[PDB]
Amino acid sequence: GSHSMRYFYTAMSRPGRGEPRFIAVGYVDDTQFVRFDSDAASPRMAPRAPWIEQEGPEYWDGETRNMKASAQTYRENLRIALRYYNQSEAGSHIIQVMYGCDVGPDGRLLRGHDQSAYDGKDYIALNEDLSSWTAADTAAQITQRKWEAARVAEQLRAYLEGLCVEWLRRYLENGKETLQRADPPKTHVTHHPISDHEATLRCWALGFYPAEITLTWQRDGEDQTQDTELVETRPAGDRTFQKWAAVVVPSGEEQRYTCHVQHEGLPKPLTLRWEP
Amino acid sequence: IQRTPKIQVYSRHPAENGKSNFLNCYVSGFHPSDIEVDLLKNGERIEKVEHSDLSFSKDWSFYLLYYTEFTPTEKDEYACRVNHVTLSQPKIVKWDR
Amino acid sequence: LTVQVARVW
C-alpha cells in the first residue's frame, strides 16, 4: 500500500555534563534503518536494517557529515531557545524534530511533514502546503520570521518532493522482501474469571507488521469502546508487534461478545470469540 | 511539562518453560528522555540488557524497548524496574505470562 | 537520506 519515511532528531542539553547529546533515527514505515548518536565512542550514521547496508561509503560518509552538522545546529538552537523563553543556563531542555514524506502505492507524494518541539511541546510546524508555517507561541514566531526571510520552506519543499520521495522509493525497492510484506496477526481469545459472576475476555494479536491494527470488542454487535481496556501496541523485538484488548463480562454472557480485528495483512476483518 | 512512563513487561514469543525466549520491558509515553530501566530475575538485576535507539511518538513522548534473552521456568520470577524524574521511587512491574 | 538545510532557530 502506502509508505512513509520519517527521521526523528532529539537534542538534549545537560549543563555541567558536557555538550548536548544529539540522537537521530530514520524509519521507513515501522522499520528503523539508521541511527546516529553523538555519545557513541565513534559517532557515525550506522545501519539498523539489512537492506540499507548495500549503500556505499559515499552514502555513509555523507550522512555522517550531515548528522554532525545537524548536531552542531541543534546545540546552537538549544542556546537560542534559552534566550527566547528567558530560561537559566542551569536546566536541561530538549528539542525534537520529525520530518519526512508519505507516498501512495504508485510512489507519488501524498504529503510532506516537518515539525519541531521544545520541551515536548509543539514549537513550529511546516503546514501541509509546504510553503507556510504554524508557530506555537511568540518565541516560535521569531523563528518563523527568520525562516521566512531565509526561504527555508522552499528548501524543505524541494527536499520533500524530490530527494525524500526518490530515496524512499529506492529503500522500498531494496527492502521489498520486508518493507513491502505485511504479516497478519495471529489471534486468540483468553478467558479468566475474576469472580463468580464476572470474567475477563482478552483478545490477542501477535506477530503482525506493520504496527497499525484495530482490535475492538462488540457485545450483541455494539462496540464496547468505553468499556474496553486497550494496551498500547508494543514491539516484539523481531520486527513484529503485539496488542491486546480486554473486556469484563458477566459470567454466562461470554458468547454475546465478539472481537473484531482489522489489519493490512488480512484480506478481510476477522471476527473471533472465546472458544471454551 | 513532564510525563510519566507507561510500562509493559512481556515476552517476544508465548512463554514455554525450558524454551529460549526474549524478555521485554517497553517503556513509552514519557518525557523527558532520561530513564533508568532494569530487568529483574528473582529480584536481582540482569546484566548487559540491550535497548533500542531512543525515538519518540507523534505526541513527542519517548519510547524504548529493553530486552534480554531468557529461558523461563515455573519457579523464576521476572520483573522490570523503572525510574524516571516523575517517579518518587522506582516502579516495579512483574512479568505476568 | 536526510535533509541538508540549515535550520537556525
Residue numbers in the entry:
A (entry chain A): 1 to 276
B (entry chain B): 1 to 97
C (entry chain C): 1 to 9
Provide text from the study.
The human leucocyte antigen (HLA) molecules, encoded by the major histocompatibility complex (MHC) region of the genome, are cell surface glycoproteins responsible for the presentation of both endogenous and exogenously derived peptide antigens for immune surveillance. HLA-B*57:01, HLA-B*57:03 and HLA-B*58:01 are micropolymorphic HLA allotypes of the HLA-B17 serotype. Notably, residues 97, 114 and 116 contribute to the E pocket of the antigen-binding cleft, whilst residue 116 also contributes to the F pocket.
As a consequence of these substitutions the C, D, E and F pockets of HLA-B*57:01 were the deepest and most negatively charged of the three allomorphs. The depth and negative charge of the D and E pockets of HLA-B*57:01 accommodated the Arg and Lys residues at the PΩ-2 position of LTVQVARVW and LSSPVTKSW with the guanidino-head group of the Arg bound deeply within the E pocket, interacting with Asp114. In contrast, the substitution of the P9Tyr for Trp, which is more enriched at this location in ligands of both allotypes, improved the stability of both HLA-B*57:01 (+2.8 °C) and HLA-B*57:03 (+8.6 °C) complexes. Arg appeared at P7 of 9mers (and PΩ-2 of longer peptides) almost exclusively in the HLA-B*57:01 data set and correlated with stabilisation of HLA-B*57:01 complexes by PΩ-2 Arg.
